């Protein structure tokens, strides 16, 4: 039924999200069980620090979950792009837990980084889609994310499944804390609702197709504004627009600079702002106000029912269900996957 | 004086500010660094779980620019945080953290809020600050005043190079008990000695940069800066300067990870991916501007801005200077009053 | 009604034990709250290691509780005699939590050690009986054990009270652990019963006076055998007999040497063996057997109902109630306090 | 020309001390190189703490060297008796470096402790005499102490050889420190002289035989007083007197609350002086192990002196133990005990 494997894979996300969780979460009793990390959790916690290492969209899934790993575990977590980690020859030691995230399990820079960590005596953990791939075999332990084969040229379902697996890993690490139990239960109940909420978000495709057929087609760049949990989503949206749509895109930390890119943009530059409640900071509102003050006409991804910009000012809304704060990225990325897909179609590009 | 603007003056002041930052703190003959503010705190800093560097804007750049040398010389985990994002994530900190705050003014709101957060959590706090007795200077437990003198220009020029130098001295101080580091120490200190005179030499690129800025470069809507490794910070800081001073969009891009283009191709950061990126550009006849070491031919049409070769971890101090001059002259050519 | 303050203090222990716990343990909800440490616990929970530092009987209360601190917290715990700590110039750093235990809060070696740790930037915690004593003032935080004044020349109720305060501190450090919950509850329900069980143990006094009068008064030395939880009890009993009674005494790790002191003993040298269930190791049984075979007749401290040796093989029994393993030393020490006291008074030695 | 393997083994110590160092110390350039640990040191240096785990005399060699490890490395070091470590079910984790010291490499409690540590993911290092014994094989890395086979029933040369191997291990761990370079050179130059100093100490044998011919040999107990570096020597002396001489003995922390007191300069604390003064106040006739030429007790109190050469403070125990080995041996002979 689908024009392309990429469209199929985006639309497959209710099912891949469920498949990632299948057999791993008891939603009734709120227990996460990751069999691959079985005899290893008590060791993983006993480390100086967690280093998340990955490339491209897999690196963004690490950015998207860093905060919740930090929050739930109180272990320091850093996130490294594999090639830059290697370029810096960043010291790694026996007391580090190195977490490698990869859809393919074959990316050269990820494998080189893994070899570097292994030879230095670090504990290694893989979060990998392709079962038995190099990264899966070579990591000490890990989780196969169970998204199924990905044939689109860019990662869609693997991103949402990686993010979910990383959240389950964070929950697993913090499963002995009385003080975390309410937070755990909140997040696990939220996860249970993700697959159906993804289905809801997919109903935005018509509005997106329309927007992609608009003046948007002709524009040469698109800027995405995000802060907090949604900065990763802004970076991933930009990567998608670049890798798939062959259009220039940058993810911008919203409102960080008063006199940055937003003071420079043309009236008609496409700007997407993430304004869901989890990441609705004063600086986000300032950035959005700055755009509208200059007569810009931004596209706002926000929660159902929220009016971020007055009806008096021209702007586009793409409304998404509200979920638990640290899970909102799973829903907010979907319109970007669809926008990047339909822009590439509007332009004649093959995405498989 | 001879200077059109405060910003131009402060750019040209860098041989002196770089010297002043080192003054009384480095014995170049015996290769000994002595930072009076940190003296009795070093043993405590050396034993922490991790160092978190926390800063905004150009000061965040100076942390990125020196992250690798801290890691290399100390083998302590070092992370670099933008103050607002650190606060947005509510990143946990604890007694065993050493939090290093870098700020020219010592008054930036987000940096102060971040310091107060770390203090309340019981972390050890260290300031690298220009303004003596500012909030950040007072409220950190210990620190180094960078001694760059007052900064009047709207964007940081001398404060970036002086912060970077102060951070390198801090890294050297932390690792001054290591026999295996001694050769690397001496190399960096002998390098630092020559920085002020090398900065004088790089400032002689101004006329070449004026010629470049008189061209259609000054009419462009975007300028991309490509760098990797030590020079990625320099790419980010060049981008920030072009945005903040020249009012032109600019982006610092990690070279070859995935319109005028500036590429950093000095030897310290001349990776395969940089060469690949540069090849991609020349293949489409892109005409890149290449910042490279004196005498190197990185490309067989392009513009070359040659800079003296220094110790790898110090190359960013010389590479940033043409970007400061480009952002300044682009602004002048576009009729912007930089002050 | 007491002959000496020391006797009064020994008999005061049901009340001092209760007074130490008062306002600090919710026995129904199994919650421990130590006001003086409350705001400091997350900091202590985080350190590289705990160093317990003390002199004499206070040093023994640290040995008596070292295992339960290690078990409940999984933080390394070492136990230092203050003078030897200072003699070795053991390095201490900002990441150490140094726990100082002292009845008087004034002992020179403990104060010197505290000053050394403070100057090195370590976090310091006091467990002290004398409110506002030097050690109470100078530590960063602490617990006043609330045992009341001791006038006896040797510590009795302050030993049991210190030991209880130390167990409460360990419970407080581990009060966020789901996996520890059952063990927590076990110990707290145990602590609730300690004051009445001490009342029960104190009923051994007449049998102990008989034993001193029939078998011990004329003696020049006595050996205490103990292992595991009861090794500290054996050392403290030895100290009491030395300090109070002016008789030689040695605490011996039971069955450690096949040809050590037990291979050398007479059949009339008095030997006390701790054989309560919590510390009834094979090596303890072997030691006892090495004694009865040599025709030594050991004095066996054991749980009510237990027959450790044959009635065929001659021995004296002092039965004590069974409590939780890590609490059994609180009851096992009491017969030793009473023995040392009666030995002293039967020799016209003042104990106050 | 020896009566027993024990006596031979005591007298072999100049050679065993030399053999333990052979090929591992460059005394000219002051460099220690332990082949067995080469590429493991950077990892050993990166642990939360070091736990030294051993039984009997090997436990004492750990006590004897704890201070120098802590001094030189600034890593926390604890010393555990293997059986008690197991009795407590002491938690250990991936970030622990567990160091096992054993002459035989077969002692049951040390083996069980090793297996417990290995199961918990700890890094394990062996300091072992018997090449290819269980503990030699099962530790991740280690140093064979190269003392030669030990046939005496109690450890004599293995103690001084284990102690020297442990000091070399601490030197190796700290070989990157500029601030400790002077202390390193001092210890290494001191190690060079230990073999010939042990020869010197063995010349006390005749004085010791005279002492053991006295009514010392029909005593029921002998107390040994020591503090600091010499507390381990007092504990090891007491063990030797119990295991060999069949006489009760206790090693006592001097001044904490027949007498041999260690009063060498490395461990001449006020509390040691005060303890000795208590004995001479009662005209108790102590036996004093002290450095050559030091008068610890004046001649108006009766006492016996056993002078030993002064070495570097942390090495003094290597010499101070030798008279106790000889005392335990000659007491047994005078008591008709076959020490073998
Ligand atoms: C593919 C596979 O055999 N998975 C089985 C596993 O699923 P389960 O979900 O338990 O395990 P995973 O597929 O996640 O992991 C399989 C194994 O590979 C390791 N690993 C995985 C990813 C990685 O990047 N690195 C790595 O080392 C894990 O530690 C584990 O040993 O147990 C279930 C039985 O209950 C079965 O339904 C599955 O057939
Ligand atoms: C400010 C001051 O009087 N500096 C004097 C100091 O310079 P010196 O270079 O020794 O000290 P700095 O100016 O770097 O620092 C001064 C004090 O401020 C603290 N600190 C500094 C920066 C910071 O951000 N946070 C912070 O706490 C330092 O720990 C130190 O206690 O001795 C010199 C002579 O030896 C004098 O010429 C300088 O006038
Ligand atoms: C002295 C005081 O007013 N104590 C009150 C406190 O007891 P609470 O049991 O809370 O506190 P403690 O008496 O144990 O400690 C008093 C203070 O002294 C500090 N400290 C204590 C011991 C030590 O060795 N070092 C040290 O620094 C503590 O951190 C605390 O700040 O609240 C109780 C009600 O809950 C009152 O009944 C107590 O009268
Ligand atoms: C046993 C052996 O062949 N040793 C050789 C080794 O001595 P060298 O002194 O290098 O090594 P050791 O004999 O100390 O140790 C041999 C090996 O056993 C390991 N180990 C040792 C003891 C222990 O308790 N646990 C443990 O794992 C070491 O890590 C090493 O891998 O190189 C020398 C050549 O330069 C040879 O003269 C020695 O014959
Ligand atoms: O997740 P993987 O298989 O390690 O691949 C990482 C990245 O590899 C390349 O950079 C791809 O173009 C990206 O789309 C992909 O995300
Ligand atoms: O270094 P400081 O005083 O904390 O200021 C940080 C940043 O603050 C502001 O953004 C300035 O415009 C920047 O130029 C500056 O780099
Ligand atoms: O517990 P405190 O006050 O520090 O005293 C410690 C020790 O000090 C001295 O050693 C006393 O004789 C002991 O009985 C006492 O236990
Ligand atoms: O050093 P090993 O072979 O582990 O032996 C440890 C102890 O084992 C036994 O206790 C021996 O009797 C002691 O002499 C010895 O010291
Ligand atoms: Na694997
Ligand atoms: Na300050
Ligand atoms: Na206090
Ligand atoms: Na081995």
Same domain, C222 and C80: no
Q: Return the number of other C-beta atoms located less than 10 Å from residue C268's C-beta.
A: 11
Identify the residue whose C-alpha is closest to ligand 2 atom 36.
Answer: B36
What's the CA-to-centroid distance between B76 and ligand 8, angstroms? Answer: 41
Whether residue C178 and residue A177 make contact (CB cut-off 8 A), yes or no, is yes
Instruction: Write out the residues of chain A at the interface with chain B, using a CB-CB cutoff of 8 A.
Output: 48-49, 66-67, 70-71, 74, 76, 78, 81, 83-84, 87-91, 93, 96, 227-228, 231, 242-243, 250, 253, 256-257, 259-261, 263-264, 281, 283
- Give A47's contacts in chain D (Cβ within 8 Å): 94-95
Instruction: Give the contacts of B133 (CB within 8 A, at least 6 positions apart).
Output: B106
Bridge partners, residue C102, by sequence: C128
Domains: count for chain A: 2
- Give C66's contacts in chain D (Cβ within 8 Å): 88
Eight-class DSSP state of A241: H
C309, two tokens:
């040796």
Reported residue count of chain B is: 339
Maximum CA pair distance of chain B?
A: 57
Whether residue B96 and residue C121 make contact (CB cut-off 8 A), yes or no, is no
Q: Are strands D31-32 and D49-54 parallel, antiparallel or unpaired?
A: unpaired
Smallest CA–CA separation between C150 and chain B, in Å?
38
- Give C49's contacts in chain A (Cβ within 8 Å): none
Identify the residue whose C-alpha is closest to ligand 2 atom 2.
Answer: B132
CA distance C8 to B325: 87
Same domain, B214 and B315: yes
- Which residues, chain by chain, have CB under 5 Å from ion ligand 10? B 140
Eight-class DSSP state of B48: S
Whether residue C176 and residue A178 make contact (CB cut-off 8 A), yes or no, is yes
- Which residues, chain by chain, have CB under 5 Å from ion ligand 12? D 139
Which H or E run includes C81?
Answer: strand C77-81
Bridge partners, residue B144, by sequence: B128
Q: Which of D71, D316, D39, D268 is nearest to D170 (CA)?
A: D71
Whether residue C46 and residue B95 make contact (CB cut-off 8 A), yes or no, is yes
A14, two tokens:
């209710």
For the domain that residue B294 is a member of, what is the CATH number?
3.40.50.10490
Same domain, D186 and D249: no
Residue B236, burial from CB neighbour count under 10 angstroms (0-12, 13-18, 19+): buried
Eight-class DSSP state of C177: B
Chosen domain end from D202, D228, D260: D202
Eight-class DSSP state of A167: H
Identify the residue whose C-alpha is closest to ligand 8 atom 13.
Answer: D56
C344, two tokens:
């002293």
CA distance A272 to A317: 10
The verdict on the CB of residue C58 being under 6 Å from ligand 7 is yes
Residue B145, burial from CB neighbour count under 10 angstroms (0-12, 13-18, 19+): buried
Eight-class DSSP state of A295: T
**D108-145 residues labelled b (16+ CB within 10 A) or e (exposed):** ebbbebbebbbebbbbbbbbbbbeebbbbebbbbbbbb
Same domain, C312 and C171: no
The verdict on the CB of residue C154 being under 6 Å from ligand 7 is yes
Instruction: Name the E strands within A63-181.
Output: 77-81, 96-102, 123-128, 141-144
Smallest CA–CA separation between D41 and chain A, in Å?
12
Same domain, D198 and D211: no
As a dihedral over the C-alpha atoms of residue B213, residue B215, residue B219, residue B223, rounded to 10 degrees, the angle is -60
The verdict on the CB of residue B132 being under 6 Å from ligand 2 is yes
Alpha carbon separation from D337 to C75, D221, D238, D322 (Å, rounded): 48, 17, 17, 20
Instruction: Give the contacts of A110 (CB within 8 A, at least 6 positions apart).
Output: A53, A54, A55, A58, A82, A100, A102, A135
For residue C176, the chain A residue with the least C-alpha distance is A178
Identify the residue whose C-alpha is closest to ligand 2 atom 37.
Answer: B24
CA A219 and chain centroid, separation: 25
* Pair A248, A192: CB distance under 8 Å: no
Q: Which residue has the tokens 């076959």?
A: D338
Locate the ligand 3 atom nearest the alpha carbon of residue C35 and give its number. 10
Same domain, C299 and C346: yes
Instruction: Name the E strands within C130-220.
Output: 141-144
Smallest CA–CA separation between C28 and chain A, in Å?
18
Same domain, B279 and B189: no
Same domain, B148 and B170: yes
Same domain, B136 and B272: no
Task: Report how many helices (DSSP H) and strands (DSSP E) chain D contains, helices first.
Answer: 13, 12
Smallest CA–CA separation between C304 and chain D, in Å?
23
Instruction: Write out the residues of chain D at the interface with chain C, using a CB-CB cutoff of 8 A.
Output: 48-49, 56, 66-67, 70-71, 74, 76, 78, 81, 83-84, 87-91, 93, 227-228, 231, 239, 242-243, 246-248, 250, 253, 256-257, 269, 271
Eight-class DSSP state of D31: E
CA D333 and chain centroid, separation: 24
Alpha carbon separation from D6 to B48, C237, D240, D335 (Å, rounded): 50, 37, 11, 16
Whether residue B179 and residue D179 make contact (CB cut-off 8 A), yes or no, is no
Eight-class DSSP state of D177: B
Instruction: Give the contacts of B338 (CB within 8 A, at least 6 positions apart).
Output: B5, B6, B7, B8, B153, B154, B155, B245, B328, B331, B332
* Pair A232, A260: CB distance under 8 Å: no
Question: CA quadruple C84, D220, D236, D320: dihedral positive or negative?
Answer: positive
The DSSP secondary structure of D245-300, one letter per residue, reads T--EEEEEETT---EEEE--GGG--HHHHHHHHHHHHTT---EEEEETT--SS-TT
What's the CA-to-centroid distance between B114 and ligand 10, angstroms? Answer: 15
The verdict on the CB of residue D36 being under 6 Å from ligand 4 is yes
Chosen domain end from D156, D171, D202: D202
Whether residue B95 and residue C94 make contact (CB cut-off 8 A), yes or no, is yes
Smallest CA–CA separation between A145 and chain C, in Å?
28
Q: Which of D55, D24, D192, D199 is nearest to D128 (CA)?
A: D55
Eight-class DSSP state of B203: G
Maximum CA pair distance of chain C?
A: 61
Count interface pairs B-D at CB distance under 8 A. 15
B285, two tokens:
């006849």
**C114-151 residues labelled b (16+ CB within 10 A) or e (exposed):** bebbbeebbbbbbbbbbeebbbbebbebbbbbbbeebe
Same domain, A167 and A235: no
In chain A, residues preceding a discontinuity (C to N beyond 2.5 A) are: none
Whether residue B180 and residue D178 make contact (CB cut-off 8 A), yes or no, is no
Instruction: Name the E strands within chain A.
Output: 25-26, 31-32, 49-54, 77-81, 96-102, 123-128, 141-144, 221-226, 248-253, 271-274, 299-303, 316-320
Smallest CA–CA separation between D23 and chain C, in Å?
31
Chosen domain end from A202, A230, A249: A202
* Pair D283, D255: CB distance under 8 Å: no
- Give A84's contacts in chain B (Cβ within 8 Å): 228-229, 232, 254
Locate the ligand 5 atom nearest the alpha carbon of residue A57 and give its number. 16
Query: Which of A25, A106, A143, A172 to probe ligand 1 with, by most ligand atoms within 8 A of CB?
Result: A143
> 3-class DSSP state for residue D224?
strand
CA distance D255 to C333: 25
The data reach a resolution, in angstroms, of: 1.8
Alpha carbon separation from B3 to B6, B9, B162, B320 (Å, rounded): 7, 6, 21, 20
Same domain, A217 and A251: yes
CA distance D80 to D76: 13
Q: At what angle do helices B158-174 and B182-202 cross, to 10 degrees?
A: 170
Q: What are phi and psi of A222, to 5 degrees?
A: -150, 130
Identify the residue whose C-alpha is closest to ligand 8 atom 14.
Answer: D154
Same domain, D149 and D266: no
* Pair C270, C215: CB distance under 8 Å: yes
Q: Which of A172, A141, A133 is nearest to A34 (CA)?
A: A172
Q: Which of B95, B10, B86 is nearest to B49 (CA)?
A: B95
Look up the domain containing B115 and give its range.
1-203
Residue B281, burial from CB neighbour count under 10 angstroms (0-12, 13-18, 19+): buried
The verdict on the CB of residue D155 being under 6 Å from ligand 4 is no
Q: Which of A7, C56, B73, C325 is nearest to D257 (CA)?
A: C56
For residue A121, the chain D residue with the least C-alpha distance is D43
């Amino acid at each position: 039924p689908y024009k392309h494997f990429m469209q199929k894979e985006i639309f497959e996300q209710p099912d891949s999200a469920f498949n990632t969780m299948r057999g791993r979460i008891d939603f009734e009793n709120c227990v996460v069980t990751l069999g691959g990390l079985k005899s290893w959790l008590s060791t993983i916690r006993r480390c100086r620090r967690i280093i998340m290492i990955a490339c491209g969209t897999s690196y963004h899934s690490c950015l998207a979950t860093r905060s919740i790993f930090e929050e739930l575990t109180e272990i320091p977590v850093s996130v490294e792009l594999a090639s830059d980690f290697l370029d810096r020859r960043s010291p790694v030691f026996r007391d580090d837990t190195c977490v490698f995230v990869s859809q393919s399990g074959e990316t050269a820079d990820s494998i080189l980084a893994l070899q570097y960590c292994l030879e230095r005596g670090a504990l290694t953990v893989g979060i990998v889609n392709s079962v038995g791939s190099s990264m899966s075999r070579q990591t000490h332990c890990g989780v196969h994310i169970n998204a199924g084969p990905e044939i689109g040229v860019a990662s869609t379902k693997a991103y949402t499944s990686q993010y979910i697996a990383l959240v389950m890993f964070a929950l697993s690490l913090s499963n002995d804390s009385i003080s975390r139990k309410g937070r755990h239960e909140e997040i696990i109940k939220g996860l249970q609702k993700i697959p159906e909420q993804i289905k809801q978000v997919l109903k935005l495709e018509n509005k997106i197709k329309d927007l992609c057929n608009s003046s948007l087609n002709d524009q040469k760049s698109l800027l995405l504004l995000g802060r907090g949990y949604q900065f990763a989503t802004a970076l991933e949206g930009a990567l998608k627009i670049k890798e798939i749509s062959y259009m220039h895109s940058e993810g911008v930390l919203a409102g960080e600079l008063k006199h940055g890119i937003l003071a420079l943009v043309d009236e008609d530059l496409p700007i997407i702002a993430f304004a869901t409640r989890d990441s609705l900071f004063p600086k986000v509102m300032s950035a959005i106000e700055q755009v509208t003050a200059r007569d810009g006409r931004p596209i706002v991804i926000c929660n159902e029912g929220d009016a971020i910009i007055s009806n008096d000012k021209v702007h586009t809304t793409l409304e998404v269900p509200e979920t638990v704060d640290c899970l909102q990225g799973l829903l907010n990325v979907i319109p970007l996957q669809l926008i990047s897909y339909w822009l590439a179609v509007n332009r004649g590009i093959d995405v498989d």
